[PDB]
Amino acid sequence: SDSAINVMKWKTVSTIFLVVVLYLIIGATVFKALEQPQEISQRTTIVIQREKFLRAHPCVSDQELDELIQQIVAAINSHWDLGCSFFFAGTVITTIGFGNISPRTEGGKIFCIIYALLGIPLFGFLLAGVGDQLGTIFGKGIAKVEDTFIKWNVSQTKIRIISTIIFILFGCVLFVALPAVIFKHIEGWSALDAIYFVVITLTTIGFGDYVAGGSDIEYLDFYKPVVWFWILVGLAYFAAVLSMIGDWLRVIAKKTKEAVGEFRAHAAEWTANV
């Protein structure tokens, strides 16, 4: 009766694996449908202005312009002053590896390995302590409004649902809405790009297409410090939200398992009623 638990474990893992595979298949087709047509437009614009630059500059040779493009690309393969190396050290221990700057000295790659293996756990302790502090702050606030609801409202199991909505709306305004407003003004980004950056950063995905403080424009003395502070409390908030979404998925997984139970049981007595 001990291998039976392992078989039931495998049964759970294999169905979750298939669901994840389905998730990747659906997402792939959607990202294809959304991003492929746009890719057509910008690759026609590079070929028109390529030949246009040849046309606009007939002195430039075809053979000598293609030789220039390759070493530009080869060059893509100060960026390391104390400010950026500090920021880079942050992108490592937070796993938000934006990658806009990354070590290419083979000594720098060795240190990057050592720095990450010790940095990730150490920063995890900090992120846990900040989340614990933010948890108690919201706890008193949510406890006060709980005790106001118990007065007019009769029974519980409903106040927790209301309370979780406050956590989202406040957390969205504090950690998503407000910094996105400042990001669009300071960084000159679109409103959607600001939300896009906020979520991509706080989920630790860190694509690198958008980086606050990354462009070489003038920045106020307090700006990057408060963004560091936003990173700290923001990662704690998104960690709780992602865990809550996971808890919702666990409930939906049981309701769907129960829903499919009611369905085939009904369809069984009907095929029997034949």
Ligand X SMILES: *[C@@H]1CC(=O)N(c2ccc(C(=O)NCc3ccc(Cl)cc3Cl)cc2)C1=O
Ligand Y SMILES: CCCCCCCCCCCCCCCC
Ligand Z SMILES: CCCCCCCCCCCCC/C=C/[C@@H](O)[C@H](CO)NC(=O)CCCCCCCCCCCCCCC
- Binding site membership for K(+): which residues? 95-98, 204-207
Element holding 72 (H helix, E strand): helix 62-76
Given 109, 158, 255, 266, the residue binding a second copy (CB under 8 A): 109
**125 interacts with ligand Y by CB under 6 A:** yes
Binding site residue list: 95-98, 204-207
**118 interacts with ligand Z by CB under 6 A:** no
236 contacts 130 by C-beta, under 8 angstroms: yes
For a second copy, which is the closer residue by CB, 125 or 270? Answer: 125
Query: Which residues contact ligand X (rule: CB under 6 A)?
Result: 79, 83-84, 87-88, 90-91, 94, 96, 101, 211-214, 224, 227-228, 231
Question: Which residues neighbour 174 within 8 Å (Cβ) at sequence distance 6 or greater?
Answer: 237
Question: What is the rounded distance in angstroms from the CA atom of residue 215 to the CA atom of residue 223?
Answer: 13
Q: What's the Cα-to-Cα distance from 34 to each of 28, 29, 31, 40, rounded to whole Å?
A: 10, 9, 5, 11
SS3 207: coil
**10 interacts with ligand Y by CB under 6 A:** yes
**225 interacts with a second copy by CB under 8 A:** no
Q: Which of residues 176-215 bind K ion (CB under 5 A)?
A: 204, 206, 208
**192 interacts with ligand Z by CB under 6 A:** yes
Type of residue found at 58: P
Structure tokens, 12: 């759970």
* Buried-state track 244-263, b at ≥16 Cβ within 10 A, e below 16: eeeeeeeeeeeeeeeeeeee
179 contacts 173 by C-beta, under 8 angstroms: no
Given 153, 250, 266, 268, the residue binding ligand Y (CB under 6 A): 250
The stretch near ligand Z (CB under 6 A) out of 6-14, 22-30, 107-115, 216-224 is 107-115
Count of residues of this chain found to bind ligand Y when the rule CB under 6 A is applied: 46
Size of the chain in residues: 274
Q: Which does 208 bind (CB under 5 to 8 A by kind): ligand Z, K ion, ligand Y, none?
A: K ion
First-residue to last-residue Cα distance in the chain: 40
**245 interacts with ligand Z by CB under 6 A:** no
Contact residues toward ligand Y (CB under 6 A) are 8, 10-12, 15-16, 19-23, 26, 37, 82-83, 86-87, 107, 110, 118, 122, 125, 128, 137, 140, 174, 178-179, 182, 219, 221-228, 230, 249-250, 252-253, 256-257, 260
